[PDB]
Symmetry: C3
Subunit: 335 residues, 3 copies
């Protein structure tokens, strides 16, 4: 009822940049809450590869992907979305988790200099994409990086197909972005003064359905080297993966997805013992794995051209003790 | 036996043009029936976009997609298929729902001026693609629009994964078509005086595996404006979706798939609470949704380039009262 | 322990060429074993189409795909991998079935003239891709044919979703391969006299994400005509299908997938009554079907351009008596 909603507790949360995730509890603390987030939209030039290739990103909270928001089923998510006067374009937000008004898009169209506050009830548990979607320019905003995900945890937290609690020690959010960067006749990537300048050239590339780059966390190598994700043997990790526009097929090289909600929806029982899972464009999925071996793992989109040539590869650096039962080199490489 | 089959009641059905579906009962009335359908194939020029782009379509019942035929499990589907002498090509039909002879393809090869009658037992419940498949010319016929779907309902109607009856108030059939239209050196679509004139140029485009157009009900915007699908708050709608040649990833913008038979087969428990489902090329799927919010919804292939640039977008106009518990604008776009 | 493993029975298994599979028991013979395989890597020219197009194949056991290795859950797979001096490249192996060191890749890097012996515990039941993945050269080896699959059977054989036993009479392994063959200025496929000579040209084609050829068992027609797979009405057949780099959507034309482990993993219950299933790039899947009709069946990737234009089509030739209840030509094609 009116009073019931009015009387619910309100709680502000500080966001953190992907692949890290803000403070949350797996089991819901008490009854339904109105969980409050604020994101400022930033239009800005980003460098997406080691050749200095530039995109005019359109970035929720200044990042590609935008940050993971975490709430529980039947909480309310209340987003203040801010479009500073320094931006050039109108923006909005479509939460796939939400019901009504084009996911919120119809209620959140903000010009530069405007802000809005949207509340919705998170009625369905799962990981879900969100993305900007201005009428008439939807894909251009999405493929300029204006997308992220949220997670709506069951109130009792995660469970396997038998209702046994699944509790992660850490969580990472990998947002995968297909970029479409115009090139000149000499094959060199083009640069533009303002976002709108690139519109016509970019749509032409979009229509080929062939990304120039496919990247995690906004750039080639963003989650490799000193920025590899980490775990220890014995540690239970949840990996949330989203792709707002194009299919992907995540794979943990050297590992598995012990439980994978490939559709991203927690009331759909997870697949198990997965090698390579599939997330369609416009969706998020989640994989749960318990690390068994130390070492460097690669986490990839298993179209290995996309992974190795186009940028869709991350690493995990895992500490701990080798398990010779699971794997051993009986004879090391030799003549 | 032939004698028992001959003793079964016949029902002659009048097909209707997609996205509408001929009158049927969700729960089968009586025992197995021989359900009779007739379709005339029409080779016809169709306009697929607002610019006036033309395709020489090959159209079951004169429409792209072909109409949805509805029977119950263990009914027999008896199709009279006619290839009028005004056509120039040989045609046939492959029913994915059928068992033997290349889905019926082997038994239904008809030249212009010929007809045939094929009967098959609908032994498996689900939605299934049908399409033309003439030896040596299979993809050309299919991507010229010569495909549709059937639905084989369980005799006891639909149920969810857990024995709850699911009874829809209305059903729509969205057929999605990838088209491969040749262009001139100035990037303008080519027209051909005869279907044959288009062939070589079309196979070249087909080889790029990149359609020029991806459309619902035969054309860009075919299911928008005054041809939008309709519903009301509280109404239960089944959306059957097919793609005979190429993957798709349906999404109801502002909604969900409450129950999605993503593989299209009713003995495979549906996924639930879906944001974006996946239907592989050569299959049909179905989603069941109860509308909770009024207004415009877009229904899209959620590669948003395919939706917004290439044509794969439809609308639903939904009447009724707004639910502020589910979503509200706390603060409308403001300075 | 190492001692306990050293004390387990060793079995030497002899590999057979796809699509055939080496002798095995569906239900496990005795307790865990160390199952021993040996494969020599062969770099050779293969001809992949009727125009005499050549690929520099990198072939496990001299075939594309490499052979299917069959073990049971909690057996040990011990592979001796040999890289002869007649080869020019460094190679390794990543088993998606294995846990640690990039699936074995980190421990199996062998130059020509070298060999290695890897052992891993097959802890998860299912069909799983394996492939070469040399640092810095991963997609190039994979798309040159350096991949296959293994099957790790549940010790008690296959069951359906309800633990009812599923026993096949025949098993076939179909390896699907996307090839990226460079062309000259006139659209002719290029030939090279060393694998390395083709590298740069191939990388350029790979980056289009558009294969020039998509084939089964290494070439157009490799599993059609005389080389059709065979079955009889009433026989239960398991069809294993893998694709190491790119999505596929298998379909048995005239048939179905009665049970389909679309993810390839046996602890994930199978989909049923399938028309067309989906296997993401980097994975294997398996379909079980009981033939009910005799004749030619086509088994395809149901992107029909990929099947009929690019080469992704096989045949089954099935003996037996026609079932007129299932399907009958009521009226044969007639004027
Ligand atoms: Cu935007
Ligand atoms: Cu969306
Ligand atoms: Cu036809
Ligand atoms: Cu088909
Ligand atoms: Cu290799
Ligand atoms: Cu791999």
């Amino acid at each position: 009822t009116a009073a019931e909603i009015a009387a619910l507790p309100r709680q502000k949360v500080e966001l953190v940049d992907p692949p890290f995730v803000h403070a949350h509890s797996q089991v819901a603390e008490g009854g339904p809450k109105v969980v409050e987030f604020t994101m400022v939209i930033e239009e800005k030039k980003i460098v997406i590869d080691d050749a200095g290739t530039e995109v005019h990103a359109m970035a929720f909270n200044g990042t590609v992907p935008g940050p993971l928001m975490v709430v529980h089923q039947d909480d309310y998510l209340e987003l203040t979305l801010i479009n500073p006067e320094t931006n050039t374009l109108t923006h909005n937000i479509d939460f796939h988790a939400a019901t009504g008004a084009l996911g919120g898009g119809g209620l959140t169209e903000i010009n530069p200099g405007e802000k809005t506050i949207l509340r919705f009830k998170a009625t369905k548990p799962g990981v879900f994409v969100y993305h900007c979607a201005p009428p008439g320019m939807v894909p251009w905003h999405v493929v300029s990086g204006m997308n992220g995900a949220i997670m709506v945890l069951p109130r009792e937290g995660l469970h396997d197909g038998k209702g046994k609690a699944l509790t992660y020690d850490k969580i990472y959010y990998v947002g995968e972005q297909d970029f479409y960067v115009p090139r000149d006749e000499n094959g060199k990537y083009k640069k533009y003064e303002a976002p709108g300048d690139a519109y016509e050239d970019t749509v032409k590339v979009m229509r080929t359905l062939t990304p120039t780059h496919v990247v995690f966390n906004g750039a080639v190598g963003a989650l490799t080297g000193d920025k590899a994700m980490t775990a220890a043997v014995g540690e239970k990790v949840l990996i949330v993966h989203s792709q707002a526009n194009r299919d992907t097929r995540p794979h943990l090289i050297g590992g598995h997805g012990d439980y994978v909600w490939a559709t991203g929806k927690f009331n759909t029982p997870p697949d198990v013992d997965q090698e390579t899972w599939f997330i369609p464009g416009g969706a998020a999925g989640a994989a749960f794995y318990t690390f068994q071996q130390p070492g460097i793992y690669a986490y990839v989109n298993h179209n290995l051209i996309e992974a190795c040539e186009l940028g869709a590869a991350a690493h995990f650096k895992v500490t701990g003790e080798w398990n010779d039962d699971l794997m051993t080199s009986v004879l090391a490489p030799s003549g």
